[PDB]
Paper text:
As a substrate receptor of the CULLIN3-RING E3 ubiquitin ligase complex, KBTBD4 is recurrently mutated in medulloblastoma, the most common embryonal brain tumour in children. Here we establish that KBTBD4 mutations promote CoREST degradation through engaging HDAC1/2 as the direct target of the mutant substrate receptor. Cryo-electron microscopy analysis of two distinct KBTBD4 cancer mutants bound to LSD1–HDAC1–CoREST reveals that a KBTBD4 homodimer asymmetrically engages HDAC1 with two KELCH-repeat β-propeller domains. The interface between HDAC1 and one of the KBTBD4 β-propellers is stabilized by the medulloblastoma mutations, which insert a bulky side chain into the HDAC1 active site pocket.
To elucidate the mechanism by which double insertions enable high-affinity engagement of the LHC complex, we determined the cryo-electron microscopy (cryo-EM) structures of two LHC-bound KBTBD4 MB mutants, KBTBD4-PR and KBTBD4-TTYML. The KBTBD4 dimer is well resolved in both structures, which were determined at 3.42 and 3.30 Å resolution for the PR and TTYML mutants, respectively. In the KBTBD4-PR mutant dimer, one E3 protomer, designated as KBTBD4-PR-A, uses the 4b-4c loop in its β-propeller to latch onto the edge of the HDAC1 catalytic domain, whereas the other protomer, KBTBD4-PR-B, more extensively wraps around the HDAC1 active site through a lateral surface region of its KELCH-repeat domain. Notably, next to the HDAC1 active site, a molecule of InsP6 makes direct contacts with HDAC1, CoREST and KBTBD4, acting as a molecular glue to stabilize the protein–protein interfaces. Superposition analysis of the two KBTBD4-PR protomers indicates that the relative position of the β-propeller domain and the BTB-BACK domain is not identical in the two E3 chains. The 2b-2c loops of the two KBTBD4 mutants are positioned at the periphery of the HDAC1 active site pocket and, despite their sequence diversity, both insert the bulky side chain of a central residue into the deacetylase catalytic site tunnel. For KBTBD4-PR, the positively charged side chain of Arg312 reaches halfway into the tunnel, whereas Arg314 occupies a nearby pocket at the tunnel entrance. Mutation of Arg312 in KBTBD4-PR to alanine reduced degradation of CoREST. A basic residue is strongly preferred at the second position of this motif, corroborating the critical role of Arg312 at the interface. The double insertion of the KBTBD4-PR mutant expands the 2b-2c loop and triggers subsequent conformational changes in several additional top surface loops across half of the β-propeller.
Author numbering:
A (entry chain B): 26 to 536
B (entry chain D): 1 to 135
C (entry chain C): 8 to 376
D (entry chain A): 23 to 536
């Protein structure tokens, strides 16, 4: 400001004022319970609350308190649509901002926060509900999201119910759901193996008299799609110097079977799976430039545009939102780390360069999350001309093309593998450790792991498929091919049968 | 950029008085196979090429190499064309089938192909492969 | 008129680098096959290059390296592990049958062209087989075994006071630039892409050392340069180089891996933009030598080199492709010229202007001839 | 963020909201001011009636919390009368308490200071103390002494003590000095007074004011008297037109706004950087291509001394002096191969050994370096881009010497290029090309352009800035034949006064050190 002088006249803005006010309000409202002026009664329990903070936090309480009714002027106000525990948790959230969310009462908190217009808690409860949806309560969550006009949760429930449409066939709530919900879940595109025609005919046959008129509309609005629960495996055989690309298809029985197998005559430096297509980079390498695209149906190889620069151990991240493949970081042939970022347009077969990274890393783990690319771990550039294992977090916003390094740090360092599941990043590092990373709250939750993994200190590859997390072993013994499925709800581990591939070395496992 | 006697080349010195001697003493290190002739019409050459390619099976290069042998004499070349057979790599039907099987099994690894076709050199196999892949 | 000597051998097309190796020397054969069908050979002298013996190749390379090259065979590969480690022969440059025959053909073509051009018999000599410019003095690199551009230049130096070497391949001509890094008799000008590209040399500050200071010119470029930008940076820099250096012979390395759509190159040049450089150089009326080298999309290479040989003879050629032995390879468009890609030009006007002004400031310090 | 074992995102976990504090603050400000709802307690000052909320007041100030929780009827009374604070200052305090921003000004500063001390508003009190330390002068240094002594404020007291002891001779005849308590005089003379101020005359005058009561303190005052020498200086390093040797001039700033030459020295080598450490001058030079020699000049002896050579060769690097650790820091610079360097090295005077520390985020060459309570700021300079060349830079890089950690501030300078910066009190004054002077406050992270008379617009010449005893002097880089213009800048009123008493045979002023 040109009109302000720091020796006579200037304005003073305090950056710690908001935090100080919040902490003072919390301390004065909870620890001593002072200056209480409105009383709320829930199920016989008496709450002494301050109308100012409640009115500033939510619009509903402001509307009720500013009304001209005698009840607003009354000291005691009764509430009957909430329980004691839920209202206590709500008051805790309003006064502190820290709320302990439990799955048993998530539905109640979701409904009540919608009623009281607490936006942030409603959004967090919606995210928790979208995580927790399973095949058991998919239609109930459909109904809830439609009632409360929540698009994200409704879309998540639609995606979960659409891909398990055959199993929902023999449930009463599937037969009883209105015509609009069925139209929405069908027109989204049901996979061919689920037999949507059986679902349509059964829904019609539930009550033929009152439902026959909707047959033509359902058939016209029907759209069907094909199979992509593929987990791509790139490996090298012990007796061969070429690369083998094996694509596995996951069944509903939790058995994994090989659907195809391809051989490439070139070494591979990096690989990513975009949609249903597999892209590999490798060029008989003092020269990482060539790229080849494999399609499952063709069982062949198609060459794509070469890399604008040849780098070793870069991270290839697939971004279906912008229909692009990103190459981030990576070493150079002169052993100097590079921070160049380049993205490849699948439609136009053209590369482009964007803003460089803040910190150069090589061999990082790249995870795409709602169009934002996270670079996890890798190897930093040590000041004394060498490289050290890294633990920093880098966030790349593809919509804005702006990158920034997170102030937080991973529990471990070094080489790691990242798999995105729902709204979380699961990262597996050396030493049999699994970390569940939530970027919105920016917190870590280590998952317990069975002692059988301690026999050898081998690295583990993690891949996510149709809502299940699979953990693979990098080194396979002769006749010993172990693939561990992980259930994140209870941290259970189940061995999966049906896998027998002569891949001694699993170079890359792609989700 | 490396600098040293074990990296750079030894550039000879330039002697202006020595220009007119070394060149006239060095033989042309190449064999001439064709030279242009300004007294020959293009239509006659085209007709001769077509006749050689169709009637006698000569390819594009061999017919013109033979034409230069008679000092651009079209009549003599045409008269002497049937007297010489343009010896190809004698790949029989059995040889073609065997090479197709070898390509199907071992791919473009011509060293392994030579194991099952010992009478064909690696250069011959490579030459045949690129002509075979056209179909 | 203008006499052009063309060096082709029917055996150089039968050498296989390996399975899926980018450099297939068979691209030369259909390059010749297009020449035989366009009718360009009517106005061209065609020669068969002799096999240069190891004595001719020792003028630049060390004797032990050439002894290894002539002694190495795939059937006794395991007996020379220390040699392969020392001489960088292996994954970069695979051992194949006829390795030394291929090297002999390339260097014989280049040296014979230099000798024929050196007797004032011909004005332009065309040798697409050679042009390998990455091989160092005692180690192979970048699919190049025996550096024949430097041998051809050394043959030219016996009669020409100053020889100017012009590079247009996407990669830096590190072998020849290294060979003549401390000499004022050879000026090496190279247009290449800088950054992470192989071999990561040719910085803007690399202007030679010793007597050769300011006698080596490097133009580092960026991704996706178009025809207009390439012409606008080639013409003035070349004009300044020819005005200051004042050469007596030109050796042009018409690398075809800078085209739009290669397997390895990332430029955006079309065939017209590539041939404009050769046409501009040919107009200076100097004893000129063209070699190939580079180029890894075979059909584009054949088209580009057929056009290059067509512009050397000042002969217009039809855009449609006449029927030949490799007609099916050029489908489905069946046209000589290739369209540019949609690649974004990263060579901003300010970048090229600054680089060109820096090069001009460097060239002013070159002493007058 | 620790990896909690008992928390998972599918069964049970703790949700912590980080936008809650800002949302609560904004909502409470809006409700309390724009709508004026839920008014609970009423405060009356000088007949003007304010409606306030006891929750916010008790949340921000402890005095109001203790006042509101009393069992007396006045606490439960609707109206409460305050008679100590003026209405306008209380309005400013309410504005600060609710909104969080307040328009500080010099006319009400002392009253705001005292009242904010009474009401236990720590942040506003500290900011007012800083702003009062900034504006201290010789005319009211003793009043600030008494104020900061009453209010138990060490920083303001130290600043006032420094200002008063560095101008003790001007306070000899002042009426306030004669009435100064003996403890204050003991503290002001025991801190170390320059010998040019004649402290013994001050003691004699103070005793002579009232001998019958101050005689007993004579021996204690004399015994506790501590004196140091004299070196108020602004080294000027430059080159003469007729000579190729750099000439260094050490000027002495008199108390009557006259700058006099104290001595001069000449060095027979080119110097690429220079800094002023304590009372000594340090220069880095050496012939091309080895500019890695230090030369230390002592003003007491007017002699050169050899010091430890630089660890590596650099050009146009920035040298700053950090008296906290007794070190000299070299920041950024260019290499002999025309490549920007981000290497940082620091030299210890006591150990005469150079040591390398962490590198910068972005390498710069020729950037201005300013010291601030141990934190080194790099301003302007040149940065390399597109791709081998350099571009004028406007980034501000902060180097914290305690943790040896460097950062880049999100904001950028109003201009770019080469610039000269001189730290003044708590502010960094930057002068660049185009007759532009900007006052930069790192604490509030804001800039204030300073209007400058059009006499600077006669020629497009660069300017150098220096600080001496809290007075800002700005010099012209180019001196015409017989023309040596030096301006004293008063930042309170942006007034420029031509100074006299300077004769300087310099044509190019390479560096100005303060
Ligand atoms: O030019 P195209 O007809 O498209 O085919 C070539 C050819 O393969 P095919 O003739 O079997 O299709 C090359 O093989 P060779 O002739 O040298 O044996 C092969 O190269 P590699 O052998 O090195 O794999 C190359 O593939 P690529 O460029 O991926 O290496 C591939 O071209 P496409 O990639 O277009 O199929
Ligand atoms: Zn090349």
């Amino acid at each position: 400001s040109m009109d302000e002088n720091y020796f006579v006249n200037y304005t003073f803005k305090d950056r710690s004022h908001s935090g100080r006010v919040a902490q003072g309000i919390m301390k004065l409202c909870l620890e001593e319970e002072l200056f209480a002026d409105v009383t709320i009664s829930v199920e016989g329990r008496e709450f002494q609350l301050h109308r100012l903070v409640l009115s500033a936090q939510s619009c509903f309480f402001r509307s009720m308190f500013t009304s001209n009714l005698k009840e607003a002027h009354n000291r005691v106000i009764v509430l009957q649509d909430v329980s004691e525990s839920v209202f206590q948790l709500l008051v805790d959230y309003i006064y502190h901002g820290t709320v302990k969310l439990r799955a048993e009462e998530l539905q109640e908190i979701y409904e009540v926060s919608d009623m009281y217009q607490l936006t942030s808690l409603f959004e967090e409860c919606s995210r928790f509900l979208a995580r927790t949806v399973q095949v058991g309560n998919c239609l109930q969550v459909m109904w809830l999201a439609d009632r409360h006009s929540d698009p994200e949760l409704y879309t998540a429930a639609k995606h979960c119910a659409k891909t398990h449409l055959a199993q929902l066939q023999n449930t009463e709530e599937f037969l009883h759901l209105p015509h609009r919900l069925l139209t929405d879940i069908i027109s989204d595109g049901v996979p061919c193996s689920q037999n949507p025609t059986e679902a349509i005919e059964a829904w019609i046959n539930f009550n033929k008299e009152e439902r026959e008129a909707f047959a033509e509309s359902l058939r016209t609005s029907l759209k069907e799609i094909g199979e992509n629960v593929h987990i791509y495996l790139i490996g090298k055989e012990s007796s061969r110097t070429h690369s083998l690309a094996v694509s596995l298809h996951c069944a509903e029985d939790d058995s994994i079977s090989v659907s195809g197998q391809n051989s490439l005559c070139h070494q591979i430096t990096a690989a990513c799976k975009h949609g249903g297509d597999l892209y590999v980079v490798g060029g008989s390498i003092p020269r990482p430039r060539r790229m080849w695209k494999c399609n499952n149906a063709t069982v062949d190889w198609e060459w794509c545009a070469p890399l604008p620069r040849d780098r070793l151990q870069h991270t290839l991240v697939s971004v279906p939102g912008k229909d692009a493949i990103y190459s981030l970081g990576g070493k150079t042939l002169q052993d100097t780390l590079s921070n160049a970022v380049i993205y490849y347009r699948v439609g136009d077969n053209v590369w482009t360069e964007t803003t460089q990274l803040e910190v150069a890393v090589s061999g990082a783990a790249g995870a795409n999350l709602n169009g934002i690319i996270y670079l996890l771990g890798g190897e930093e550039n040590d000041l004394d001309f060498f490289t050290k294992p890294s633990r920093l977090i880098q966030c790349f916003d593809t919509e804005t093309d702006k990158c920034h390094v997170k102030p937080y740090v991973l529990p471990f360092a070094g080489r790691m593998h990242a798999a995105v599941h729902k709204d979380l990043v699961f990262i597996v590092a050396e030493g049999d450790s699994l970390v569940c990373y939530n970027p919105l709250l920016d917190s870590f939750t280590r998952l317990c792991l069975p002692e059988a993994w301690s026999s050898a200190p081998s690295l583990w590859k993690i891949a996510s498929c149709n809502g299940s997390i699979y953990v693979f072993r990098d080194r396979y013994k002769k006749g010993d091919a172990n693939t561990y499925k992980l259930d994140p709800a209870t941290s259970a581990v189940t061995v999966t049968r049906g896998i027998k591939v002569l891949l001694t070395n699993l170079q890359f496992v792609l989700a | 950029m490396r600098v040293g006697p074990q990296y750079q080349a030894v550039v000879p010195d330039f002697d202006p008085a020595k220009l007119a001697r070394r060149s006239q003493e060095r033989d042309n290190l190449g064999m001439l196979v064709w030279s242009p002739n300004q007294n020959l019409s293009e239509a006659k050459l085209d007709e001769y090429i077509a006749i050689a390619k169709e009637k006698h099976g000569y390819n594009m290069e061999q017919a013109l190499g033979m034409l230069f042998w008679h000092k651009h004499n079209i009549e003599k070349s045409l008269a002497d064309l049937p007297n010489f057979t343009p010896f190809p790599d004698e790949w029989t039907v059995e040889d073609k089938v065997l090479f197709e099987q070898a390509f199907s099994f071992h791919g473009k690894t011509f060293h392994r192909i030579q194991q099952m076709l010992p009478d064909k050199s690696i250069a011959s196999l490579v030459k045949f492969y690129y002509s075979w892949k056209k179909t | 008129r203008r006499k052009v000597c063309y060096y082709y051998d029917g055996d150089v097309g039968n050498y296989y680098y390996g399975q899926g190796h980018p450099m297939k020397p068979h691209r030369i054969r259909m390059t010749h096959n297009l020449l035989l069908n366009y009718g360009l050979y009517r106005k061209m002298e065609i020669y068969r290059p002799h096999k240069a013996n190891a004595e001719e190749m020792t003028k630049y390379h060390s004797d032990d390296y050439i002894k290894f090259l002539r002694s190495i065979r795939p059937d006794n590969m395991s007996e020379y592990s220390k040699q392969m480690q020392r001489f960088n022969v292996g994954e970069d440059c695979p051992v194949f049958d006829g390795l030394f025959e291929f090297c002999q053909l390339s260097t014989g073509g280049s040296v014979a062209s230099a000798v024929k051009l050196n007797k004032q018999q011909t004005d332009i000599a065309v040798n697409w087989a050679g042009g390998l410019h990455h091989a160092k003095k005692s180690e192979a690199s970048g699919f190049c075994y025996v550096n024949d551009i430097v041998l051809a230049i050394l043959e030219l130096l016996k009669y020409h006071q100053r020889v100017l070497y012009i590079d247009i391949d996407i990669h830096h001509g590190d072998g020849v630039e290294e060979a003549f890094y401390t000499t004022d008799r050879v000026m090496t000008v190279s247009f290449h892409k800088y950054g992470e590209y192989f071999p990561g040399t040719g910085d803007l500050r690399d202007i030679g050392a010793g007597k050769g200071k300011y006698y080596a010119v490097n133009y580092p470029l960026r991704d996706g340069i178009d025809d207009e930008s390439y012409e606008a940076i080639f013409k003035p820099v070349m004009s300044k180089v020819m005005e200051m250096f004042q050469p007596s012979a030109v050796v042009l390395q018409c690398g075809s891996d800078s085209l739009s759509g290669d397997r390895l190159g990332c430029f955006n040049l079309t065939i017209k933009g590539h041939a404009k450089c050769v046409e501009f150089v040919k107009s200076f009326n100097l004893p000129m030598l063209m070699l190939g080298g580079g180029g890894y999309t075979i059909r584009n290479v054949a088209r580009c080199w057929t056009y290059e040989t067509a512009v050397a003879l000042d002969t217009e050629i039809p855009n449609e492709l006449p029927y030949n032995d490799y007609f099916e390879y050029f489908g489905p468009d069946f046209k000589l010229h290739i369209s540019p890609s949609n690649m974004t030009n990263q060579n901003t006007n300010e970048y090229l202007e600054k680089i060109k002004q820096r090069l001009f400031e460097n060239l002013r310090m070159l002493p007058h001839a």
